[PDB]
Amino acid sequence: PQRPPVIWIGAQECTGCTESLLRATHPTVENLVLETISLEYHEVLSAAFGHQVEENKHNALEKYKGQYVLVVDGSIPLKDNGIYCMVAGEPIVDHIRKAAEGAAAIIAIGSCSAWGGVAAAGVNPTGAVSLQEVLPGKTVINIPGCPPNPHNFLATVAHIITYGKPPKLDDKNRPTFAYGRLIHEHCERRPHFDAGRFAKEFGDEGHREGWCLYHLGCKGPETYGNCSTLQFCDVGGVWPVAIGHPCYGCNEEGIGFHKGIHQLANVE
Amino acid sequence: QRPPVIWIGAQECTGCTESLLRATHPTVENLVLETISLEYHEVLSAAFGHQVEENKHNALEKYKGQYVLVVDGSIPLKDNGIYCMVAGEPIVDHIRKAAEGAAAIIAIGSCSAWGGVAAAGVNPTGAVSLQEVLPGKTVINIPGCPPNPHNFLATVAHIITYGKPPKLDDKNRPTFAYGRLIHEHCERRPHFDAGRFAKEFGDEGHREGWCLYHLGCKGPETYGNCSTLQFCDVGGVWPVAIGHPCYGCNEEGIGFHKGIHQLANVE
Amino acid sequence: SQRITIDPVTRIEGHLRIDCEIENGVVSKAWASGTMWRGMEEIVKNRDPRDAWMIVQRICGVCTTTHALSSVRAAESALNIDVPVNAQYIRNIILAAHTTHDHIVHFYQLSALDWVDITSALQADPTKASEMLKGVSTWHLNSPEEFTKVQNKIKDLVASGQLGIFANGYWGHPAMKLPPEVNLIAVAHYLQALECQRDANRVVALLGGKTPHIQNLAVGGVANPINLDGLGVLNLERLMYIKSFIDKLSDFVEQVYKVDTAVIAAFYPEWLTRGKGAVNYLSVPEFPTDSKNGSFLFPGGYIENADLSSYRPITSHSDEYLIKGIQESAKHSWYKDEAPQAPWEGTTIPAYDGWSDDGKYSWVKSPTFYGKTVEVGPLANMLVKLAAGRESTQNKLNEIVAIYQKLTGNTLEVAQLHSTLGRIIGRTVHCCELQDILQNQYSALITNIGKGDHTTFVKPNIPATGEFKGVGFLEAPRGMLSHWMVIKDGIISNYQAVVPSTWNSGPRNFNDDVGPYEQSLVGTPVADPNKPLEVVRTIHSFDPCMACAVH
Amino acid sequence: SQRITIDPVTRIEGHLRIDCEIENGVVSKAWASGTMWRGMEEIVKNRDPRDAWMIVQRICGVCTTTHALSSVRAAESALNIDVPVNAQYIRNIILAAHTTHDHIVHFYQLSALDWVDITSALQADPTKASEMLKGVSTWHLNSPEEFTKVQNKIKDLVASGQLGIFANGYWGHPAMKLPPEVNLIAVAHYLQALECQRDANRVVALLGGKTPHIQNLAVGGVANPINLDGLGVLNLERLMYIKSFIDKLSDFVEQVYKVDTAVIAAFYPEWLTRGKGAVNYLSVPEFPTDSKNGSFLFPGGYIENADLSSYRPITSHSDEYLIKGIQESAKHSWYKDEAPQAPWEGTTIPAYDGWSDDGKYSWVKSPTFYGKTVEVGPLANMLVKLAAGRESTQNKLNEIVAIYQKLTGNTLEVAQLHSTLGRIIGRTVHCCELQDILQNQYSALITNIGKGDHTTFVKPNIPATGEFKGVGFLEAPRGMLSHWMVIKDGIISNYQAVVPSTWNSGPRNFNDDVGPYEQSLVGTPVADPNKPLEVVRTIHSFDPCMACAVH
Ligand code: SF4
Ligand code: SF4
Ligand code: SF4
Ligand code: SF4
Ligand code: FCO
Ligand code: FCO
Ligand code: F3S
Ligand code: F3S
Ligand SMILES: [Mg+2]
Ligand SMILES: [Mg+2]
Ligand code: NI
Ligand code: NI
């Protein structure tokens, strides 16, 4: 039986978004690539290199025209005509625009591709921008986080395959099942917030009783995500706040990588 | 040499033993081969009948002053103990005898901890807690119906690794697992605070994961770790996360007394 | 005539005493006795019908889910509620996954040590043991290196001097017949079973909210909120997680449990000719798939006098023939009212007066079906399926038979299934068939949600006056379960559970006829009356649960 | 004579181009080029020192944790903070577990397909393949039935016509030397590796809060609240969970990964005589265990001109000899300032002018140690450990050598470790030794908490005036990592990372000397210049990470 094709392109990526797939359990990366999809191009895992892997991409773009899911991780650098990310001697923005032409669905995985992320922070030395900015005519599905829980991506792909369409998206084109609510509007430390029970420093008495991390700079009040409910790694009870560290807002433009760890969030 | 454990079932449904089969740290196979010596447990013993009663007597003598005694189920006192008879003797007599040489005594589950479902309603058998039948002893209570098995296993591990019980609250429950109300650490608290409530299963709010207070959630009057530790180590599995209110199974006077849909008192 | 008592019977759920008269090394008469009572039927009286399921689930934690489902079905029957089809699929998945866990634990952790000798495993050659399974199983964990590692765990345990749960077992008993190699294989599979059963319970937990004791039911459906696009509810990610565990069950069940069942038959073939408990068998259909509490995936029926060709089919949980036939007696039980009672008019008034061979000797009631004793459970269930011409069941039986034939050069015929080993075979067949139930019902759920149906719950109304009666049937791991609820002025005025182990373990009835456990023991050879291993072999084949039987 | 380009190099992290001149079928000169830059050093400038780690962790997600730890160590060095010993144990566990994941993924998912021919695996006899490993490994999942199942997955993939990531690989290439059986074994182990690496990352996650990109560090210690009696914090239950995953790693690492390393050496023995990258080697000590940022479990040092007997030990992260030696040049890199710069005075001013063989051809800087080129990473690390007479490392190497000898009847000498295969061997040894680091540090944590020490964090003060410099060293999976922070008026006035792949992949330096990747390729035979498999074999042995190299 034929599996739906996927083309995965890395731009200004740290490779964390690919590495997240190695933590996934439903599907596991081995079930993903053998049973769920045909991963037709992915530079991190391909047996083929060089001219052979570029052959594989061209064959796949033609053979599966109008049928493949395009996935991009990393921001796309526009400064100085795209020279800050060059693959096979051509700017990555050109590879991405070409692959976008025949895509059935386009997914920006991670905060970098979704809104510029860490690569576009501060002075933005390379003119890094989001996938949606380089593809203004297309609907890009954004799966933010640095990196997101891999199932935020895999359940989005599964929806496309199983039901023939994208999941419901909010007005930033993020899937509502994973990004439809503020972390602070579904955080198990909310009772402590409400009671004025706050950790003031790591290692203090309140911190060691699992109190609210607002005063350590928790950005849950201005960050959309499923980090408090879905959490990470499928072991139970693992997300940053549960471990004792405030949310940094890595999902959310203007929060993660812009505000200091210990800078307070605005509360609605 | 592994620390010895004697496990006695009284008026039990066997759910407290079955919880061990869901454990991952340790798994039940690592528990019985590496962590403890499980010297008597009727559900798992190769031996039966006179042979298993031999094993108990040998163990009570050999490991006097060293074994952890665990009891699940309530103890029926009505009509001189005849509602639970093992080898022709009331279970309360087996438990008192085993309690004499125990290094530590653990009531696993709400039944042994406070009477539980077996003592609810008219209490047909005069079911009481392990602490009530052992008035001279400190009983460590690990309530829930059944509790997360690690609430028990981490209590045993503390006894073995550090030589003493974990910190206990004033009902002799370990603070790491029962030190806080469910509602004082529930991820649906934001919805409670905003007036976002499910009114019926399947309605719009319920399907958005709103607070279950108005369906009768007993989180506001139940101590436990169900919202944080949760169940089965898969991530995101406890009654409220699945869509059903807390029933108060941990807590005397709540679970098995109040109706599912009866509202809790809020502090 | 020599008199023995087995008390406690271990590796069961709950508190059981078995007494036997032995004449010339053969059991001539037996008594089964449930020695613990809680009065769960009394505890649940006078409550809102909606509350019952949470309380009566605590009848048993081994067969968790079963009493919960049977209770809501009973209330739904009284109230005349049609359960939404998504709630049925979720209920079905839970029951099927649970039963998979339960049967695996039964074969390995509860039963295997009757047939398997741990100390003989220490003499095994791991390489020969592995070689013995070539062309019998394709299981990936039957290597000599796996067996050597298991052998070394046993060796370390024995050298420590703390055998614990393996101490004082029936090592070297004359009824132990497996070669060393096969004992070593069984122990490796015993340990591997624990991983499979954990995966099955992860399925249960993801839909139930935990296990033991699920918490997702309601009179009217389930509390799972279906919303593929919802955060914190039953969405596509959660469904994919569930599916990942469903998919992990099949290989162990087919390549290990099924194969071990055939192997134990091959080495203990005399156990196909003893342990017959009854000549009548009863099961109910299970796994409804329509929007009106019907269209069952598994059929039910009644077999009279071992005649499969003239069995009576049961296709509905409202079948008046099934309903009217069921009664229970307390003549030889510790309750006051002795005449056979239909469960809607049942009473449970304790009247303990001590043990008496000819009077009262058990807390278990004696159920009958139109006055006859009946075996329930996986044997009943398999024979009913075979009688109905269910090809799936015939094919699965044939796979077991083929392995047995390869090992012995003989076949199994239906007459040999009315036995201790036949009962065990039925259980294994049941477990194998449940893997297709899981696949089917998961796909049905996915497809239905995709058609736009996200409904899970119909809110009941309960009239404040009037009296009305409901009954909830379920084919539990150990057999036909029924809960019987009478509602009067909005509350439960009577609640009676008739539980599968009640049918099998119940004492002599109003006409002094002998129920299945007690009948199955007549003719059992006993080599050593101080160590009656042969007796617990037969009893264990029924998978006794005394908390269930007595409640 | 011929010019080739390999672009992209796959099965690495990030964006790499390799160019080669080939003369008479042998690489005569090569160029390594990092083709992507982000400017992470510039992005983190002018921020509070405490904020850096969360930003610079994003240099790389493959070697997640490493930049985070090196950044807080740098801030702690500038501020003169002594990290509490519980924070060290937690940091150590994370690094050790992470590196275990990383090395396994490298050997199997990144490297194996250079040496292994999946189409040849289809011709294998599964039984012979299993038979080949008897007396070589005690691994429990090397049965013929396991291999047959893997073979059938490959077969189904090939029959589908959608090879995906295996499409157009180097199947049948003359440099592929494994028999069919060994190719089938490697693929089975490839899939089994994915389960072990997941267990390693569960350890990381339980302490870090997630992975990739941990979130439990702080300048001053860690954010894990230690309280054995606390709900919702790092208590005994959580510690027991962590331990359960630590304990699952060892068997695969010892019985599979270690053994496969020896086997690949046995079939490709010529790869012990090529791929030498340098004559100087550098590693830092790792895993501090005291309350003053020292007492390292693994030693470090500098080896000059391959002379182990006269190596210089490094026992401290504040070693002024190590600190003063390190510079970087941009003469052949796309930056403006070309003279060698000490990293506290470093600049990263982009100056892209296109590719030129004799000018600028990479975004990677060229690091030197007292003016010399140096190899870093597992080979450096192993040689340094052998130089120090570390018995653990000699013993682990000897276990690999013994397996190799059993297969070939030859031995390995230290001279042969200065090679492509020697590099891979160092990595495997590192992974094996880390399993004892995990056991040791978990036990130290448990013991220390039991003595009454629950401290995890010292709150830093940062003076609002003055200029302070700090450097944070760490022995990362790919080698010595250093972050260099200048604080001025309370904020980061300069930030420079010198990353292990910078050392190895860096282009020709200020004196035009050739760095490790480029040097290692000289002399590589190339059978087919259109399919230069032999070149990527050597490059992959360094475990390139270009996001790291360039940042
Ligand atoms: S979003 Fe984060 S993890 Fe993903 S590529 Fe960007 S920096 Fe790496
Ligand atoms: S501030 Fe952060 S820790 Fe506190 S309740 Fe909000 S999201 Fe939770
Ligand atoms: S507390 Fe609950 S699960 Fe545990 S022995 Fe009592 S009824 Fe069973
Ligand atoms: S009432 Fe229940 S669901 Fe709502 S916040 Fe409290 S504990 Fe959570
Ligand atoms: N299965 C099961 Fe338990 C019994 N008997 C019930 O119902
Ligand atoms: N390991 C690793 Fe990444 C590289 N090079 C860092 O630091
Ligand atoms: S930092 Fe990121 S991973 Fe979640 S907890 Fe905050 S959005
Ligand atoms: S019903 Fe019991 S299991 Fe926890 S959620 Fe409430 S205390
Ligand atoms: Mg009854
Ligand atoms: Mg740098
Ligand atoms: Ni039961
Ligand atoms: Ni890296």
Side-chain angles (χ1 to χ4, degrees), chain A residues 1-20:
Chain A
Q2 298 299 279
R3 288 163 284 117
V6 175
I7 301 296
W8 186 300
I9 298 168
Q12 293 175 296
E13 58 170 346
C14 80
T15 305
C17 302
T18 294
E19 282 281 357
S20 78

XYZ file of all heavy atoms in Angstrom, chain A residues 1-20:
150
model
N 0.818 -1.223 0.000
C 0.000 0.000 0.000
C 0.854 1.278 0.000
O 1.843 1.345 0.733
C -0.827 -0.123 1.296
C -0.049 -1.052 2.189
C 0.947 -1.820 1.346
N 0.473 2.267 -0.814
C 1.232 3.531 -0.947
C 1.021 4.466 0.252
O -0.098 4.643 0.720
C 0.855 4.280 -2.240
C 1.169 3.524 -3.530
C 2.650 3.231 -3.707
O 3.421 4.085 -4.140
N 3.054 2.017 -3.361
N 2.104 5.078 0.721
C 2.063 5.981 1.857
C 2.163 7.430 1.386
O 2.840 7.709 0.387
C 3.193 5.627 2.824
C 2.935 4.320 3.564
C 4.183 3.751 4.206
N 5.054 3.125 3.213
C 6.296 3.495 2.890
N 6.911 4.525 3.474
N 6.938 2.814 1.946
N 1.478 8.360 2.081
C 1.512 9.761 1.647
C 2.918 10.384 1.744
O 3.599 10.234 2.767
C 0.517 10.465 2.570
C 0.330 9.557 3.710
C 0.542 8.166 3.197
N 3.343 11.073 0.668
C 4.673 11.622 0.596
C 4.862 12.910 1.404
O 3.945 13.742 1.518
C 4.849 11.891 -0.898
C 3.461 12.139 -1.400
C 2.563 11.322 -0.561
N 6.068 13.042 1.939
C 6.492 14.204 2.727
C 7.902 14.624 2.274
O 8.784 13.776 2.087
C 6.511 13.864 4.234
C 7.054 15.012 5.054
C 5.127 13.471 4.713
N 8.085 15.930 2.111
C 9.354 16.534 1.780
C 9.697 17.478 2.932
O 8.936 18.381 3.236
C 9.213 17.361 0.470
C 8.763 16.497 -0.699
C 10.504 18.100 0.145
C 9.755 15.439 -1.053
N 10.837 17.273 3.567
C 11.232 18.038 4.749
C 12.474 18.820 4.406
O 13.490 18.230 4.067
C 11.543 17.081 5.905
C 11.826 17.726 7.247
C 12.834 18.615 7.561
C 11.135 17.478 8.470
N 12.779 18.949 8.894
C 11.744 18.266 9.472
C 10.054 16.666 8.820
C 11.301 18.262 10.796
C 9.605 16.680 10.142
C 10.234 17.479 11.105
N 12.398 20.144 4.517
C 13.516 21.028 4.207
C 13.958 21.799 5.438
O 13.145 22.467 6.085
C 13.186 22.040 3.098
C 12.855 21.320 1.787
C 14.386 22.949 2.880
C 12.251 22.215 0.718
N 15.263 21.709 5.718
C 15.910 22.449 6.768
C 16.523 23.738 6.271
O 17.340 23.738 5.346
N 16.145 24.849 6.898
C 16.652 26.163 6.555
C 17.646 26.616 7.656
O 18.686 25.948 7.828
C 15.470 27.107 6.361
N 17.381 27.700 8.400
C 18.230 28.061 9.554
C 17.762 27.364 10.837
O 17.216 27.999 11.757
C 18.260 29.570 9.769
C 18.954 30.353 8.684
C 18.841 31.827 8.916
O 17.742 32.363 8.886
N 19.964 32.484 9.191
N 18.031 26.072 10.870
C 17.497 25.137 11.868
C 18.654 24.750 12.821
O 19.813 24.723 12.407
C 16.983 23.865 11.160
C 18.132 23.237 10.373
C 17.902 21.883 9.815
O 16.917 21.224 10.214
O 18.768 21.487 8.975
N 18.331 24.425 14.073
C 19.261 23.789 15.004
C 19.118 22.260 14.977
O 19.881 21.559 15.630
C 19.030 24.347 16.426
S 17.638 23.645 17.362
N 18.106 21.775 14.254
C 17.751 20.369 14.053
C 16.937 19.782 15.241
O 16.573 18.611 15.233
C 18.963 19.500 13.647
O 19.568 20.068 12.489
C 18.547 18.078 13.245
N 16.590 20.640 16.214
C 15.748 20.257 17.302
C 14.374 19.764 16.909
O 13.839 18.869 17.558
N 13.795 20.344 15.864
C 12.487 19.916 15.381
C 12.528 18.495 14.795
O 11.622 17.700 15.056
C 11.845 20.982 14.442
S 11.640 22.613 15.254
N 13.595 18.130 14.093
C 13.774 16.723 13.656
C 14.027 15.808 14.820
O 13.462 14.721 14.902
C 14.938 16.580 12.646
O 14.594 17.272 11.452
C 15.186 15.131 12.290
N 14.901 16.231 15.716
C 15.214 15.439 16.904
C 14.010 15.154 17.764
O 13.973 14.105 18.403
C 16.269 16.138 17.753
C 17.676 15.976 17.198
C 18.333 14.632 17.498
O 17.776 13.766 18.195
O 19.451 14.416 17.016
N 13.023 16.059 17.789
C 11.784 15.782 18.523
C 11.103 14.478 18.053
O 10.581 13.707 18.869
C 10.824 16.965 18.487
O 10.143 17.052 17.259
